[PDB]
Design a protein around this ligand. Structure first.
Ligand code: CL
Ligand code: CL
Ligand code: CL
Ligand code: CL
Ligand code: CL
Ligand code: CL
Ligand code: CL
Ligand code: CL
Ligand code: CL
Ligand code: CL
Ligand code: CL
Ligand code: CL
Ligand code: CL
Ligand code: CL
Ligand code: CL
Ligand code: CL
Ligand code: CL
Ligand code: CL
Ligand code: FE2
Ligand code: FE2
Ligand code: FE2
Ligand code: FE2
Ligand code: FE2
Ligand code: FE2
Ligand code: FE2
Ligand code: FE2
Ligand code: FE2
Ligand code: FE2
Ligand code: FE2
Ligand code: FE2
Ligand code: FE2
Ligand code: FE2
Ligand code: FE2
Ligand code: FE2
Ligand code: FE2
Ligand code: FE2
Ligand code: FE2
Ligand code: FE2
Ligand code: FE2
Ligand code: FE2
Ligand code: FE2
Ligand code: FE2
Ligand code: FE2
Ligand code: FE2
Ligand code: FE2
Ligand code: FE2
Ligand code: FE2
Ligand code: FE2
Ligand code: FE2
Ligand code: FE2
Ligand code: FE2
Ligand code: FE2
Ligand code: FE2
Ligand code: FE2
Ligand code: FE2
Ligand code: FE2
Ligand code: FE2
Ligand code: FE2
Ligand code: MG
Ligand code: MG
Ligand code: MG
Ligand code: MG
Ligand code: MG
Ligand code: MG
Ligand code: MG
Ligand code: MG
Ligand code: MG
Ligand code: MG
Ligand code: MG
Ligand code: MG
Lengths: 173, 173, 173, 173, 173, 173
């Protein structure tokens, strides 16, 4: 007996949404780890910290909107463990930005695969949901991180003593 | 070479704080799961949903304050996987409240063990931190959940058709 | 079957809290008696009256916070008779202040014994409660009464005709 | 040597006023006990709690106005022990309301006896005081408690699971 | 004959409080010296000056609260000479920050010893006072100085010509 | 190599300014000691306390303006120990006022000697500085203390029981 609300919602889509929820919660956790790296006494870049904390909270938002979608369409949320990030020590502001850029591209690829599945299953509601709330958000995020990586590289991060300090106070501040 | 800030901070305390961070993030995840259970089309108790979502966000706050403490004292945050909750289907408003009460008592026991360790290691800063921000918060939470469980039981939840509906709109609304 | 909320709360602590509730209600009654002594036609020191009435209402506050604590921790309030004060006729403003100082020191000693018991029973929540809401309040009260006793003594109370009158209007007014 | 203010004030009236002061303080204590019964984790009817706490504070007001009267007329306040209430466990919202109704009728009977004594002693000031501040207050209180008892009985308290809960939130809230 | 207010206050605690008052006044003097070093014509880092002047005034606050505590508990303040700071010429912004960090750790160690003494003498009021007003303040101060030292080191202070100038205007400004 | 700013500033003036800085810090410490004497439980003259605390803070101001002058003129501040006051127990309000008057006259004599030195060294900037900020301030302070001493003497301090009490509340309040 399916949910009384379910219509045109393929089980494969339901499962792929559960996988995406986990990936968004994972991304939130990565950014939380980065936020607290930058508030270490031996790093102390408070605007890098604030930037990644904000990104962490945005990813939780991305997870919740997918959870809401699952309920709206009559699917059933199935949560899984949230894996720990690949590092606790993120090495530098530049390295954290590079890792965030890679993460965002990986999440983007997942979203594009989800869109292809929704298209294959003739689910225009799901296609529109991804286009409206996810795909452009990802493109903007990737572009912003690319901008930040370029400036940090050009400024001489991480080894040039003034580079991350000045980027912290003038770009992220 | 210890952190330049570290003073009177035992490695066992540092490790126990890392364990507590994981437990608080776990509690956040349990409450997030409960929040979205109550917005299922076949449950649809929107104030139970809002109540647990608020609890979820409070637990993230508890995790972050411990992460901040670790940095302030010169310890190093070590994150671990956040285990999935024990259930996706929380059965009823009463059952969710009972599970939350058990969770809060378990977290409390962990905090009391942490306080005993801090006392044993002569760390009054850590003892005060737990007393100021954690122990009374836990006592208030446990009491509130106890109140809610009692009322739901007396009203005839979960089988009495009006009980969870009326509790949703008059206690949690 | 203990309360569903009870945790780390020793029966000896529960009983000592009941004893403390009675002592706070007793102190409220002593100060109420003093308040109405000072509004006798043959005493007529209206600011001494107001001062002790305020102290009486504060002690009721101290009793209620302990009653709340008992409920929060899952103990059961057990009330006893509130003994009448040792006098109806408090003799003078100076004598009332001296009696209040002795009362406050006695209540303080009780609170210190309660703190020692809570420490012995490894109850940091109860220890913190006493430190946060009781111990400093007592130290401030004892100091204030000491100040008042000194000034009244130096001014020549109770026999110097102007002393209590002027203290009433310039310190307590 | 009587008070310089005393006039037309019989010793029997003075003594009966002292007895009434004790009865009003007793009633305050009964209602304080009831207030904290309703905030137990296994009762948790917060508007019953608030209702009885308010009644407790009103009774203290009734005691103080009699204490003031004693001073105004030149009598001497004589305080006695405040007996503990007959119960700590008040069983149910309905039972507490029934006990409060009985208490109010008993206090009323005492006030009517005091009025009869004042009449016998030709004390119109005391008669007017009781009529102005006590007798109608009692009639209103008894009527209100009667209303509450009737509704709770009709609703099926204490055994009907929704009755006290709904009365708490819709009459007392 | 002890003070009329004194209770549960050991002579060893009284003496240790006098020693702590002197140490706080000493710390105030060190920071005053640093403040005026940075306004020399050949140093001229006005935000380093303002930062240390603020720290100096905070230490006077720490001294006064201990002086107040001594009076509140019935001890007797015993002042001693305030020793001059170890240097008049503080060499650089980085060196001043390093010296301040060492000073704060030394004051912290003193406060931890005072807390251990208060614990040994069963003085929970004094323990709470130190925890409430001193211990967390010290942890925050040490962390802040650690952050500042790290940034100055990374930026290339004191020899890199732009480092202290830019830190002055962007962190301390 | 002198400071790039130094002009018409004799080494003897520089040294005399350092001596004056120490004397102003000493005066601050004397008044701080007096302030806390008057808040003892066995003295308890809160407006004497406030009066001397204000004087203490003014003396710190006098010290800082001389420190600023030293920097402005290109001299080098040389701090010395701040000697403890001659007493901890200041005996009475009258005695404290007499001691403050003597202190102010001594500081005045020092300032007059500094002015004579500045005149001898043809330093009109330093002469003007002392005249503008110090000499009239001292004359006003000495006059005020003289007024206070006279009133306290006439009122019968320290032995007349009402004198210091009434002066506290009507002159210093
Ligand atoms: Cl479907
Ligand atoms: Cl997994
Ligand atoms: Cl489609
Ligand atoms: Cl350590
Ligand atoms: Cl794991
Ligand atoms: Cl400790
Ligand atoms: Cl227990
Ligand atoms: Cl008894
Ligand atoms: Cl403990
Ligand atoms: Cl009469
Ligand atoms: Cl009796
Ligand atoms: Cl009549
Ligand atoms: Cl003692
Ligand atoms: Cl010394
Ligand atoms: Cl202790
Ligand atoms: Cl020169
Ligand atoms: Cl010296
Ligand atoms: Cl000249
Ligand atoms: Fe973003
Ligand atoms: Fe955002
Ligand atoms: Fe995302
Ligand atoms: Fe793993
Ligand atoms: Fe993202
Ligand atoms: Fe984004
Ligand atoms: Fe909560
Ligand atoms: Fe909240
Ligand atoms: Fe928590
Ligand atoms: Fe698992
Ligand atoms: Fe919790
Ligand atoms: Fe403690
Ligand atoms: Fe909570
Ligand atoms: Fe008070
Ligand atoms: Fe108050
Ligand atoms: Fe009290
Ligand atoms: Fe008795
Ligand atoms: Fe008290
Ligand atoms: Fe505390
Ligand atoms: Fe008090
Ligand atoms: Fe009423
Ligand atoms: Fe009312
Ligand atoms: Fe009444
Ligand atoms: Fe009895
Ligand atoms: Fe009544
Ligand atoms: Fe009549
Ligand atoms: Fe009438
Ligand atoms: Fe009433
Ligand atoms: Fe500071
Ligand atoms: Fe500050
Ligand atoms: Fe300090
Ligand atoms: Fe020396
Ligand atoms: Fe400090
Ligand atoms: Fe600080
Ligand atoms: Fe002045
Ligand atoms: Fe001033
Ligand atoms: Fe001066
Ligand atoms: Fe000396
Ligand atoms: Fe002066
Ligand atoms: Fe002055
Ligand atoms: Mg995955
Ligand atoms: Mg931050
Ligand atoms: Mg764990
Ligand atoms: Mg909702
Ligand atoms: Mg007792
Ligand atoms: Mg009055
Ligand atoms: Mg009776
Ligand atoms: Mg309540
Ligand atoms: Mg020392
Ligand atoms: Mg400046
Ligand atoms: Mg000198
Ligand atoms: Mg004061």
């Amino acid at each position: 007996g399916p949910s009384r609300v379910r219509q045109n919602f393929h089980p494969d889509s339901e499962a792929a949404i559960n996988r995406q929820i986990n990936l968004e919660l994972y991304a939130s956790y990565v950014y939380l780890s980065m936020a607290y790296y930058f508030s270490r006494d031996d790093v102390a870049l408070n605007n890098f910290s604030r930037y990644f904390l904000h990104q962490s909270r945005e990813e939780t938002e991305h997870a919740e909107k997918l959870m809401r979608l699952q309920n709206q369409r009559g699917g059933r949320i199935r949560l899984q463990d949230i894996k720990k990030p690949e590092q606790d020590d993120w090495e530098s502001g530049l390295h954290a930005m590079e890792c965030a850029l890679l993460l965002e591209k990986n999440v983007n690829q997942s979203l594009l695969e989800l869109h292809a599945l929704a298209s294959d299953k003739g689910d225009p509601h799901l296609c529109d949901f991804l286009e409206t709330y996810y795909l452009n958000e990802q493109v903007k995020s990737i572009k912003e991180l690319g901008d930040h990586v370029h400036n940090l590289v050009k400024m001489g991060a991480p080894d040039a003593g003034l580079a991350e300090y000045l980027f912290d106070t003038h770009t992220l501040g």
